From a paper:
The enzyme has an unusual cooperative reaction mechanism involving the association of two dimers, bridged by the [name] substrate, to complete the active site. These data indicate that [name] functions as a [name]-specific ring nuclease in type III [name] systems.
The structure was solved using molecular replacement with data to 1.84 Å resolution. The electron density clearly showed a molecule of [name] bound between adjacent dimers of [name]. Notably, the [name] structure presented here crystallised in a different space group to those structures published previously, which has allowed the arrangement of [name] dimers into a pseudo filament arrangement with a [name] molecule sandwiched between the D69 and H60 faces of the protein. The rotation between adjacent dimers in the filament is 144 °, coupled with a translation of 28 Å. The majority of interactions are made by the D69 face. The [name] hydrogen bonds with the main chain atoms of I22, S44, G45, and I49, and side chain atoms of S44, R46 and R71. Interestingly, R71 moves around 3.3 Å in order to form bidentate hydrogen bonds with an oxygen atom of a phosphate group, which we predict is adjacent to the phosphodiester bond that is cleaved. We see no evidence for the ion in our crystal structure, which may be due to the deletion of the H60 side chain.
Author numbering:
A (entry chain A): -1 to 98
B (entry chain B): 0 to 103
Write the structure that this text describes.
RNA sequence: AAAA
């Protein structure tokens, strides 16, 4: 109720975008229901929210080919590469254009 | 462009980074990661992009836990393989730990 | 709290 996920399918990743309605407390990490994804595709995590929410979510998709964190300045920065891409690679995605 | 300060405690290693100027994602290919005592959890702290924080949290996932410093709260546990649970907050004040300047 |  403080938080909601939009899950968008793309060829090479699933986009997971969160929207925080009101300021969250860390106790929420114990209660959050994470979106299920196609585990054969990497994940791009997007949203305006605390660094600890991002780190929590990135860890929760570590079992996928890669995890990329959305930077509105750049695209999605690969922060974990298990089976695909390299850390520091940028995926050319504009999340604002998908959501608008 | 970015340097590390390693602060050894009994309960955790505090890794604090400092950025001299804006970094580019390419830096993640070049960064040398401080080695830690892997039998103690890690607290990550610093002023930098969310992707840097996520990159560092994953690089210390082989330790008992990874906590991310929030100046409003303390160190929020984002990963645990210890008594600590995700969403637990470690009472640290990094601003006070760093007073007087730490060599990076 | 998308460069705590």
């Amino acid at each position: 109720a403080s938080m909601k996920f939009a899950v968008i399918d793309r060829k090479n990743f699933t986009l997971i975008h969160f929207e925080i309605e009101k300021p969250i407390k860390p106790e929420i990490l114990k209660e959050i229901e994470i979106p299920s994804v196609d585990t054969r595709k990497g994940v791009v995590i997007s949203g305006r929210g605390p660094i600890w929410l991002h780190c929590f979510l990135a860890h929760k998709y570590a079992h996928t080919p890669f995890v990329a964190v959305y930077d509105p300045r750049l695209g999605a920065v690969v922060v974990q590469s298990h089976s695909e891409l390299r850390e520091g690679d940028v995926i050319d995605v504009v999340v604002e254009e998908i959501l608008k």
